[PDB]
Structure 1
Amino acid sequence: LHKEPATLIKAIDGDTEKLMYKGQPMTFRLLLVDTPEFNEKYGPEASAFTKKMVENAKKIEVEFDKGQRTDKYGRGLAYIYADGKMVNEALVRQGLAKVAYVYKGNNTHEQLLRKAEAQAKKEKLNIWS
């Protein structure tokens, strides 16, 4: 897989964000994770965590996996990086997301994110508390 440029347009919530990719605005849904909705427990925290991470970054990158690049809603499906740190992993490591929606053929970072979930779960963080 390879990283590609993008710039923040607007944070949306824990696992969706509006980015400019190849010069076009797109809503991106983070692969392999599920954050609570804003109205749910930990949803406000998930939203703030992603928003801070992507807004503070000097450099946003998108990384598509090997399979479908957009979902049935027109959202791009990617790993998003903020100054080289993967937002998908960082949410899971903090117990602000669950590993979820693992579909074969877009699951390259599955095991990395499960390792992070296991550690958030150990530490009883947030969703695991």
Structure 2
Amino acid sequence: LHKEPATLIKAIDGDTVKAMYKGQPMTFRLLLVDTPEFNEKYGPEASAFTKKMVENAKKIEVEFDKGQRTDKYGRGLAYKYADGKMVNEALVRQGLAKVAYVYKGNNTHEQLLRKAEAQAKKEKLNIWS
């Protein structure tokens, strides 16, 4: 996979971030994760975690997988990186997202994220507490 440039527009919630990509605004939905909705337990905590990560970064990048790049809502499906650190993985490692929506052909980083989830679960963090 390849990292491409994006510029933060707005963090939306734990797993969606609006960013300028090839000069157009796109809402990105993070691949292979599911954060709680803001109205749900750990929802505000996930939202804040992603918000801090992307806002504090000198740069953000998006990395598409091999399969679908857009979902049925027109959201970009990507791995998002904040100064080279993957947001998707960080959320899972902190127990603020479950590995989820793992579709064949768009699951390059599944094992990375499963390993993170196992570690979060062992530490009883957040959703696993």
Give the structure-2-normalised TM-score. 1.00
SS in 1 for 2:13: coil
Identity %: 98
Q: How far apart are the structure 2 equivalents of 1:6 and 1:29? A: 14
Aligned-residue Cα RMSD (Å) equals 0.2
Compute the displacement of 1:115 (Å).
0.1
Structure 1: give runs of 5+ residues left out of the alignment: none
Compute the displacement of 1:123 (Å).
0.1
Q: How far apart are the structure 2 equivalents of 1:79 and 1:23? A: 18
Q: How far apart are the structure 2 equivalents of 1:81 and 1:11? A: 13
Compute the displacement of 1:6 (Å).
0.2
Compute the displacement of 1:69 (Å).
0.2
Q: How far apart are the structure 1 equivalents of 2:3 and 2:99? A: 21
Give the structure-1-normalised TM-score. 1.00
1:118 aligned residue:
118
Q: How far apart are the structure 2 equivalents of 1:36 and 1:80? A: 18
Report the number of matched residues.
129
Q: How far apart are the structure 1 equivalents of 2:68 and 2:96? A: 25
Structure 2: give runs of 5+ residues left out of the alignment: none
Compute the displacement of 1:120 (Å).
0.1
SS in 1 for 2:124: coil
Compute the displacement of 1:56 (Å).
0.1
